[PDB]
């Protein structure tokens, strides 16, 4: 049903909050790259999907805790969205 819509909203919330909190945790650490919000949002997407481009990573303790929260909630919610799309697709498979 509209559970996928609620999972999508949770995923977006996780991505935005992870971007904001990642920038907040990483600024102040020399060499840190997760320090501007757009690419922190990109990194949140990469984390939720586990796509593994490896172009951005947190180097502080709190940045890595933020990363863990984005992994748990982001991977779970993105898994819910993906499951919903798959079920809808096989639902389309009965047509032909």
């Amino acid at each position: 049903w509209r559970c996928a819509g609620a999972a999508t909203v949770l995923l977006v919330i996780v991505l935005l909050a992870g971007s904001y909190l990642a920038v907040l945790a990483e600024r102040g650490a020399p060499g840190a790259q997760l320090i501007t919000y757009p690419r922190a949002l990109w990194w949140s997407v990469e984390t939720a999907t586990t796509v593994g481009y490896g172009d951005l990573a947190p180097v502080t303790l709190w940045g890595r805790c933020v990363a863990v929260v984005v992994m748990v909630a982001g991977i779970t919610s993105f898994g819910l969205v993906t499951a919903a799309l798959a079920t809808w697709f096989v639902g389309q498979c009965q047509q032909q």
Partner: antibody, heavy 118, light 108 residues
Amino acid sequence: QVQLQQPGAELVKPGASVKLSCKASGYTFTSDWIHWVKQRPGHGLEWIGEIIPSYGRANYNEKIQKKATLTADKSSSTAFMQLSSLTSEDSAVYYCARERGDGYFAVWGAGTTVTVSS
Amino acid sequence: DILLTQSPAILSVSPGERVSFSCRASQSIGTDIHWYQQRTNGSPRLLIKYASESISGIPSRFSGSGSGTDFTLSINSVESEDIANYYCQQSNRWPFTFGSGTKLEIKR
């Protein structure tokens, strides 16, 4: 409208302290960072530190001695830099700048000329 | 910390010709470089962001180029109002750092 407003000058006795202000106008976001830059006469720009007013965390340049403390008032939309125990090496123009969390300083204040003397 | 080297420190040109400012980073920083102009007694003013993106209110004579470690600020046809110091600035890694600046002077 001048988006960032700073006092023109402050005179500080040696070993004393001063509190510089930077009143912000225009668009305000929680992604906003306020930075402070020091410029000695005939010299270049020197990054001092940053603060995110919508949370209150500040970071400081570690390559120089920490003679500053950053605060912010969300009501008056005003950032403050406290310079403590000043020598004559601290006499300079002090700018504040607004960065929308995307890495560049879109707007700058006019700067506060700080003179340390008796 | 990223060291931004601006060489030469002084640039002397005749009016109307094209001038290029050099900024070189001690390591690769993608396109996370930004350029500022500071006239005598004035505040710095943003000219170019992210190496090449124009800024509203900045004359089209200004452009930027580069990626990795080598970046260039270009003025297509210099006029007297371009006389100032020019600073580059990186946002790729904490902390943000500035170059030491290049002075533009005009031979008239």
